[PDB]
């Protein structure tokens, strides 16, 4: 059969209050969005790592570890006093990264 | 230094016309979105593989690099009804293992 090299875990995120946008700024994410008289609760699909490196790595010639990478998704947010549609950083994957020894 | 086990590539995607939503249905993705008298071009951040995996113990493991996905909300069309739907886009390149024999 088939296994992950790095064990991931995926959930819905419905209680996001803060985030950093693509321009590097810390912003406030609203709980509710309004698109043409339609009230949707603002939810996010996120994937990250599940906490001796990665599975199946040739450990003789390689150090390694599992790391959470991210994606940018559009979201309704607040940069101080100005509300806007901004791209924000959320967890999206767990991937293995290598390192040569010595 | 530090390397990827699987080589990925990330781009903006601004010409998406179709997609499959989270319920398994093939839907049409609109080019433009309208949120409170504000017209935004509908863009997507996607990552995928660059055409086994680097650094794998190939003696005990078969392996290959594979594109995984995420769900992101988008303005869409299921036939005649416009709606805010989660759709599947490329989000990562990850290695998957397989025991030999």
């Amino acid at each position, epitope marked *: 059969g088939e296994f992950s090299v790095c064990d991931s875990v995926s959930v*819905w*995120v419905g*209680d996001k209050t803060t985030a950093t946008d693509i321009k590097g700024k810390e912003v406030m994410v609203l709980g509710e969005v309004n698109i043409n008289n339609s009230v949707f609760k603002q*939810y996010f699909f996120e*994937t990250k790592c599940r906490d001796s490196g990665c599975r199946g790595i040739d450990s003789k010639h390689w150090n390694s570890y599992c790391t959470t990478t991210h994606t940018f998704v559009k979201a309704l947010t607040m940069d101080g006093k100005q509300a806007a549609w901004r791209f924000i950083r959320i967890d999206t994957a767990c991937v293995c990264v290598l390192s040569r020894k010595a | 230094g530090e390397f990827s086990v699987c080589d990925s590539v990330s781009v903006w995607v601004g010409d998406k016309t179709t997609a499959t939503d*989270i319920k*398994g249905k093939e839907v049409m993705v609109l080019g433009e979105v309208n949120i409170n008298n504000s017209v935004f071009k509908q863009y997507f951040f996607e990552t995928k593989c660059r055409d086994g995996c680097r650094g794998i113990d190939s003696k005990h493991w078969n392996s290959y690099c594979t594109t995984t*996905h*995420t769900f992101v909300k988008a303005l869409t069309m299921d036939g005649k009804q416009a709606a805010w739907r989660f759709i599947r886009i490329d989000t990562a390149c990850v290695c998957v293992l397989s025991r030999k024999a």
Partner: antibody
Amino acid sequence: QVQLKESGPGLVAPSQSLSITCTVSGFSLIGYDINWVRQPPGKGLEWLGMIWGDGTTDYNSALKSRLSISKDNSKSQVFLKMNSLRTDDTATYSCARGGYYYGTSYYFDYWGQGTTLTVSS
Amino acid sequence: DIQMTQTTSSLSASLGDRVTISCRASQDISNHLNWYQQKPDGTVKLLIYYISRFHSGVPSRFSGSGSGTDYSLTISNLEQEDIATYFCQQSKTLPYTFGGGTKLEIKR
């Protein structure tokens, strides 16, 4: 430390309503889909519907809109409701957590035991 | 809907044998195919998802394959605890559907 437990009446007459609650523990309903499933005696499983993480729902069209699911995230409970029962609704009913491997595939990773329901006069 | 079919709903094998549970989708489901084990005690457990992937805490001897609309679960080295019913499920599209299951007798 992840379980689901369903509690229900056991007997309801034709044309009366049905309420089952799924009590959940070891995880939060804010983050996970919950599915409802049904196995009539000596027959195959049948998916009834689900409440997504965000509170939205989808139902099996075969039920002709007789079924509804609602939830209270703070109380860790999902609520199945069915109107206008028939002897055909005689089954064991179970709730199951939805689990995702990225947005790539989807499965039911954790299953409740099941509550037996007989519809009869 | 997408029908999932398990044409042989009964199977009998001996300890150590390799058994194949098969499943057929009525339309292409690509890889959105899960395998469950319902033991006689009533409990249900996810064995395999996405055709061939293992859920955590599942034996090496389980194995998932597929060709076209056909999908197999293979249990190598059959052990006594494998007395159960084995059923598939497509997670491609709503409504989700299940095969009617394949019950496994272990000879003695």
